[PDB]
C-alpha cells in the first residue's frame, strides 16, 4: 500500500525538497536533518539523535511497550543496535572519563603490584624438602640403567 514517493531517495540539496522529505518522514522541517552528504549511501534518511531506547520514557503508553516506539514515528538508522538488549546511552551518576580513569587506574595498579610480589615472594625460614632415594629418582621418570649421582641428606 506504500507508493513510490514514500521510499527514501537521494540527498536533498534545495529547501523545497528538504521540506518534502521532512514531510515524508512525518517530522518538522526544522527537526529534519539528513546525514552529511558523503559516499556512504545514507541518501535521504533523517539523522535522529544517537540516544538509545532504554532512556526513553518507560511510563508513556507506546504502541510497542517493549521496544518503546510509536507506530508512525520515524525510526533511527541504528535502531537494532539500541533495543534495550544491547548498548545503551543512559547517563550515569559518574562521568564517563572518571570511570575510565578510575577503572584503568585500578587495573594498572593491580598488575604492577602482582609483578612486584612476583619479584618479592614470601616463604618460610626452612630449607628445601628432602627426599630419601636419590631425590625419588627411580619413581620420578625412571631410567634405572643410568645409576645417577647418589645424594646423602644431612642429619642435624
Amino acid at each position: 500500500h506504500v507508493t513510490k514517493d514514500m521510499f527514501p531517495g537521494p540527498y536533498p540539496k534545495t529547501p523545497e525538497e528538504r521540506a518534502a522529505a521532512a514531510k515524508k518522514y512525518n517530522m518538522r522541517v526544522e527537526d529534519y536533518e539528513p546525514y552529511p552528504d558523503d559516499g556512504m549511501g545514507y541518501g535521504d534518511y533523517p539523522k535522529l539523535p544517537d540516544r538509545s531506547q532504554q532512556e526513553r520514557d518507560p511510563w508513556y503508553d507506546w504502541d510497542h511497550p517493549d521496544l518503546r516506539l510509536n507506530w508512525g514515528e520515524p525510526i533511527h538508522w541504528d535502531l537494532d543496535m539500541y533495543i534495550r538488549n544491547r548498548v545503551d546511552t543512559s547517563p550515569t551518576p559518574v562521568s564517563w572519563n572518571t570511570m575510565c580513569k578510575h577503572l584503568f587506574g585500578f587495573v594498572a595498579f593491580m598488575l604492577f603490584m602482582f609483578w612486584v610480589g612476583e619479584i618479592y615472594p614470601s616463604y618460610q625460614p626452612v630449607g628445601p624438602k628432602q627426599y630419601p632415594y636419590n631425590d625419588l629418582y627411580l619413581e620420578r621418570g625412571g631410567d634405572p640403567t643410568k645409576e645417577p649421582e647418589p645424594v646423602v641428606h644431612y642429619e642435624i
Binding site: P10, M27, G41, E55, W77, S90, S95
Partner: protein, 128 residues
C-alpha cells in the same frame, strides 16, 4: 559548587541538565505543540486502524518499510566514490587479509625451518 558531569557518546547528557530546556521562548513552545500534534495525529490514525473489529491483519507501518528499504536497498544508488569511502573500503577490505597472510606465512616458515633442522620434537604426533 559541585564537580561537573561531563557527557560522552555512550553516556549522554541528563534530561534535567540540558541548558536548552531552561531557555524557553514562544517559538520553542510552538515547536513542542506542533511536535505533539504530529505525534497525536499518528497515534489517532494507529488507534483508528487498531480498534476496528473488521480488520484482521497486520497493520502496515510505512516507517518500518522506509527503515528497512533505506538500510538495505537504498545504499548503492546513493554511493559516490569519495576519498573517505575509497580509503576506508581499501583499508577494511585489504589490510586484515594481508596482515593475516603475513602472520600465517611467517608462522609456517618458522615451522618448516624447525622441521628441516629437525629440532621440533614431533613425537606422538600422528593425527593431522
Amino acid at each position: 559548587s559541585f564537580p561537573k558531569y561531563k557527557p560522552s557518546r555512550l553516556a549522554t547528557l541528563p534530561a534535567t541538565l540540558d541548558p536548552a530546556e531552561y531557555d524557553i521562548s514562544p517559538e520553542t513552545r510552538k515547536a513542542q505543540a506542533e511536535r505533539l500534534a504530529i505525534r497525536s495525529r499518528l497515534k489517532r490514525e494507529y488507534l483508528l486502524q487498531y480498534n476496528d473489529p473488521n480488520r484482521l491483519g497486520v497493520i502496515e507501518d510505512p516507517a518500518l518499510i522506509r527503515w528497512t528499504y533505506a538500510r538495505s536497498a537504498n545504499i548503492y544508488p546513493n554511493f559516490r566514490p569519495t576519498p573517505k569511502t575509497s580509503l576506508l573500503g581499501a583499508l577494511f577490505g585489504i589490510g586484515p587479509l594481508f596482515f593475516w597472510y603475513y602472520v600465517f606465512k611467517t608462522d609456517r616458515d618458522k615451522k618448516e625451518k624447525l622441521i628441516q633442522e629437525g629440532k621440533l620434537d614431533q613425537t606422538f604426533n600422528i593425527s593431522y
